[PDB]
């Protein structure tokens, strides 16, 4: 089986930047059978380049592809916002046809601090015996971020589930959700619930909390 190795795995491009990504085949492919697809978030992949260098239908001129043998590449002449997507190479010369794992291309923007919001368990959830505490960390940039939970001042790691949005198509920011779930029993045995976000944009963590007994 041909293995297609793409690099880089992820790339952040400034608007207008000339970007090149690569696809290396474990064995020599006839260039006639090396194609690229573009998959925008939320959508199906779409043929972008076929036979190494030919632009598919609807594809802007700033795209190009080149290569031969075991080495192929894809170039975007000037990064545009609408180019944020995962790009896959694929070989059709050998059965089974195989795809590279994809290069995820994202867009650079000015730093933005997260907007942090914390929420106590609803009555409805407490009624059923559970207690989830939610923290939203919204509209931030760059994408790297760390969340720490504390209960009555002590760090809590188990029972935390995190989820990230894809880069926002309108403002190129990232958002995150972090949910700490415990039993109603454990929740009523503590008071202070805190989520602390460490991000490039501040020299101390952003800390939001609530006490179970606030009024």
């Amino acid at each position: 089986d041909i293995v297609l190795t793409q690099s880089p795995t992820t790339m952040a491009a400034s608007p207008g930047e000339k970007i090149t990504i690569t696809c290396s085949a474990s064995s020599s492919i006839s260039s006639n059978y090396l194609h690229w697809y573009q998959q925008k978030p939320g959508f199906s992949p779409k043929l972008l380049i076929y036979r190494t260098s030919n632009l598919a239908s609807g594809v802007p001129a700033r795209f190009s592809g080149s290569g031969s043998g075991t080495s192929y590449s894809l170039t975007i002449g000037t990064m545009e916002a609408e180019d944020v997507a995962t790009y896959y190479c694929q070989q059709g010369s050998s059965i089974p046809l195989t795809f590279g794992a994809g290069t995820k291309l994202e867009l650079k923007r000015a730093d933005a601090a997260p907007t942090v919001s914390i929420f106590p368990p609803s009555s409805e959830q407490l009624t059923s015996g559970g207690a989830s505490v939610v923290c939203f960390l919204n509209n931030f940039y760059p994408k790297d971020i760390n969340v720490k939970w504390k209960i009555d001042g002590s760090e809590r790691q188990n029972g935390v589930l995190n989820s990230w949005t894809d880069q926002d198509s309108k403002d190129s920011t990232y958002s995150m959700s972090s949910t700490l779930t415990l039993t109603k029993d454990e929740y009523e045995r503590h008071n202070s619930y805190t989520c602390e976000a460490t991000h490039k944009t501040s020299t101390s963590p952003i800390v939001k909390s609530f006490n179970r007994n606030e009024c």
Binding site: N32, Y33, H35, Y37, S44, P45, K46, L47, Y50, R51, A56, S57, T86, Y88, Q90, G92, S93, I95, P96, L97, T98, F99, A101, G102, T115, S117, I118, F119, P120, P121, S122, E124, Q125, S128, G130, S132, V134, F136, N138, L161, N162, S163, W164, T165, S175, M176, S177, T179, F210, N211, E214, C215
Partner: protein
Amino acid sequence: EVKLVESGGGLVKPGGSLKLSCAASGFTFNNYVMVWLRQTPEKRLEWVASISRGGSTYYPDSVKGRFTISRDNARNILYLQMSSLRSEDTAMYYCVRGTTIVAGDVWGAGTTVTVSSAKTTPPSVYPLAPGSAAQTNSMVTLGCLVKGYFPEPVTVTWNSGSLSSGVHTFPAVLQSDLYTLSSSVTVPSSTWPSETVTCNVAHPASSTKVDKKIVPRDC
């Protein structure tokens, strides 16, 4: 407007069977090789089956014997019969038109297959409102927590779709065979209490739909 439309995907038990359909239009179907691919929850793309115009079929070893691709040139429909399903078969399945250089030049929207012994379970929807002692600061962020459902997907809207912007609806995460997803919405200070804010949560697998109004918290 060449088009491919996949259907038939859903939840099925390991060891089970399931048939996908892909309806083709806007092109001369019998002239083309047709392909099933799938994309795993990790986003990896994999070849599943190919069928030549005349009905020659090809499979990777991983599905050979278990999956059968067939076509009906009369109705212009491509099928994938899945059997002896495994959890590793969980993926979004795509109907794809192939070309003689083995590029997929037309793809459908996809259909989702989930292979699991976990049972269909409707979601619980909890309102996320700030603590009673939280301090008002221009914009306000609210949310809905959507917990304990299976399988994917769930859809979430605010105000039946009329609260459109300021919304972040997070990817579901699976824990102990149940999904949790959350959604946040941001609106201006005075806009709330005043104007009703509700999240609407559909879970078709369970024929569930529910609305949760977000009310200010009070000690």
